[PDB]
Amino acid sequence: TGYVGLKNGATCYMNSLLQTLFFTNQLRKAVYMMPTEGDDSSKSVPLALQRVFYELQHSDKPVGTKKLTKSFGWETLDSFMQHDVQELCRVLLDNVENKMKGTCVEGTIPKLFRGKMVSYIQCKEVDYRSDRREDYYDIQLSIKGKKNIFESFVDYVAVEQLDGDNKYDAGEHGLQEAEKGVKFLTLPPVLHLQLMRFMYDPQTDQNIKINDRFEFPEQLPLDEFLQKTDPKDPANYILHAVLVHSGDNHGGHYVVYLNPKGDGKWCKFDDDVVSRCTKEEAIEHNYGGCTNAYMLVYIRESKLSEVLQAVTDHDIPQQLVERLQEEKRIEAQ
Amino acid sequence: FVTXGYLXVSXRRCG
Numbered sequence: 001t002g003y004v005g006l007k008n009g010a011t012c013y014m015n016s017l018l019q020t021l022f023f024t025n026q027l028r029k030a031v032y033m034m035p036t037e038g039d040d041s042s043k044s045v046p047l048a049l050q051r052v053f054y055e056l057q058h059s060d061k062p063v064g065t066k067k068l069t070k071s072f073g074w075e076t077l078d079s080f081m082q083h084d085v086q087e088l089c090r091v092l093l094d095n096v097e098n099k100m101k102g103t104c105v106e107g108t109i110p111k112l113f114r115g116k117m118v119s120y121i122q123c124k125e126v127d128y129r130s131d132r133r134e135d136y137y138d139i140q141l142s143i144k145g146k147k148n149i150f151e152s153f154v155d156y157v158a159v160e161q162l163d164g165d166n167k168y169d170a171g172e173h174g175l176q177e178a179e180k181g182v183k184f185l186t187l188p189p190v191l192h193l194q195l196m197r198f199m200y201d202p203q204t205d206q207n208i209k210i211n212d213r214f215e216f217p218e219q220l221p222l223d224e225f226l227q228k229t230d231p232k233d234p235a236n237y238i239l240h241a242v243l244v245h246s247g248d249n250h251g252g253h254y255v256v257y258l259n260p261k262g263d264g265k266w267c268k269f270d271d272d273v274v275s276r277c278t279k280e281e282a283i284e285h286n287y288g289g290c291t292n293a294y295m296l297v298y299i300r301e302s303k304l305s306e307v308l309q310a311v312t313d314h315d316i317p318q319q320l321v322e323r324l325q326e327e328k329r330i331e332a333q
Numbered sequence: 334f335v336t337x338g339y340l341x342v343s344x345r346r347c348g
Contacts, residue, residue, distance in 0.1 A: 012341060081337040082344050198340050200347045207340040249340045 001267045001274045003260065004055075007062045008271040010077035011069060013085045013243065013294075016256035018065070019269045020241045020297055021092070022056050023260040024190055025311045030108035032316045034100055041327060042067035045092060046099040054316065054324050062272035085243065085295050086138045086194050093137065112307065113137040113192065116185040118227075121168055124177045128170050133185075138192035148215040149193070149296075153225050157182060183227045187235050189303035193296045197245075197288075207249060213289025216242075218264075218279070220298055237298035238262055242282050246291035257282035262304045 006015040022028055031049055038044060041051035048071040055063040069075055072091055080088070097109035120131045141152040160180035162168040168178035197210045222235040229235065242257045255270040257277065266282040268275055286293040299307050334347050 077339075078337050081339070081341045083341060084343040084346070085341070087343055087345075198342050200335065200342045205335075207335050207338055207342045209340055247339065249338050252339045 001276055003267055003269070003274045004059050005062045005269060005272040005274045006056075007064050009069065009075070010080065011065065011074070012077075012080040012252075013245070013254050014065065014069070014074075014080070014088060015271055016243045016254050016269070017085060017089055017092075018052060018068075019056075019256050019258060020243065021089075022053055023241070023258055024112065024297075024307065025309050026307050027108065027112055027190075028053050028057075029309075029311045029315045030100065030105040031096060032311075032320060033103075033105040034096065035103055036099070036320070036323075038323070039327070039330075040067070041324075042070040044099075045071045045095045047071070049092060049096060050320055051324060051327070054320070057311070084140075084194060084198075086140070086192065089138065089192065109137075110135075112190045113188050115188040115191075117182050118185060119182040120180075121162070122179045123168065123170055123173065124179065126170065126173045126176055128173055128176070137188070138194060140194045140196055143195050143197055143212070143214045144199075144210055146214060149217070149220065152195075152214075153222065157184070157225055184222075184225050185227055187222055187226070187237075187300070189300050189307055190240075191237055191298040191300075193298070195294050195296065197292065197294050209245075209248065209290065211288050211290050211292060213287050214292065215287050216283070216293070216296055218283060219301075233300070233302050236301045238301050238304060239283070239296065240299050241295075241297035242286050242293045243295040243297075244286050244291060245294050248290060257286070260308070262299060262308050 031053055034046055036046050036050060038047045041047045048068040052068050074080060093109055100106050100108060115136050117136055118133045122129045142155055143152060146152045162178040162180055167175035170176040201208045218239050220237040222237060223229045226235060240262060244255050246253045255268055257266055257268050259266045266277050266279055268277045
């Protein structure tokens with residue numbers, strides 16, 4: 001394999017997400033570049049993430065996360081259970097993005113993850129439209145009643161009828177029939193897709209998991225979902241990570257399958273155990289139909305070699321190396 | 334807004 005794992009607290013999906021971000025090489029390098037200053041890594045999320053990444057890249061033994069979880073404050077089962085995985089992703093990404101504000105690696109995070117969409121609500125019978133353009137760093141895909149990810153995307157951009165009791169509140173126009181919908185303008189180099197298998201059911205008053213089968217491909221063409229395609233850069237996406245959950249409301253187990261280089265050589269990361277596996281273990285075996293994927297990472301075929309550029313010892317600033325080496329000395333005696 | 338439990342759901346999806 002050539003890759004090292006993470007130690008297993010009740011941190012659930014974190015290790016899975018941490019490996020996922022570590023192997024986003026371009027992000028890893030920018031996190032290395034981010035200027036930071038501190039004697040303890042637990043003293044900020046940027047420091048702690050720099051440390052975790054440094055150790056994943058250099059240790060031969062499983063890497064600890066105590067100082068990382070201390071730095072962002074999620075130290076109980078309940079703090080992970082109250083959040084979706086992208087909320088933790090945002091917590092880490094947003095902080096690091098704001099740490100890069102006015103630095104040499106400024107804008108790295110939106111460059112890698114941010115796409116553009118536009119939502120609209122058009123009234124049928126009156127002249128009112130509420131066209132709102134917004135930016136995204138991840139996409140929450142509905143899987144209920146969807147056999148595969150193409151149907152998720154179809155349902156995502158489907159026009160919703162606001163009619164009957166759903167009649168749009170058009171303010172001074174009163175209740176109005178209208179047509180809701182969203183359009184993709186761009187798709188980012190690195191595409192985070194949550195599969196919304198976990199949801200609160202208000203009918204039964206319970207959190208539930210949907211274990212139905214839901215297929216996703218090695219290569220994901222998304223040109224059909226763009227408002228305007230680019231003939232020079234078809235939106236073909238290459239599957240990078242499959243974040244997997246096993247279990248029910250009484251316990252569960254999280255692993256991530258990752259092909260770090262985007263070549264197809266897949267390795268399963270199960271906390272401290274990292275092992276080469278087959279493409280079938282990574283993909284089809286996680287289709288479900290209680291162990292299945294709840295989040296995927298895809299990378300644009302055209303950006304693959306930039307996003308997954310090698311990150312050598314040379315790409316880590318000496319000031320950081322020295323900070324981490326001093327910390328390791330103080331932790332050794 | 335449930336007693337946890339090992340199924341994570343955002344509280345922003347619980348109202």
